[PDB]
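Tumor necrosis factor receptor superfamily member 13C
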Amino acid sequence: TPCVPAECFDLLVRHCVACGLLRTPR
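Structure:
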């Protein structure tokens, strides 16, 4: 039961966060 396509697991904060945390990926 990990994060979700919406939020990705970041190492900085060690948890799920809005994948990218920015507008438009690349």
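Strands lie at 7-10, 15-18.
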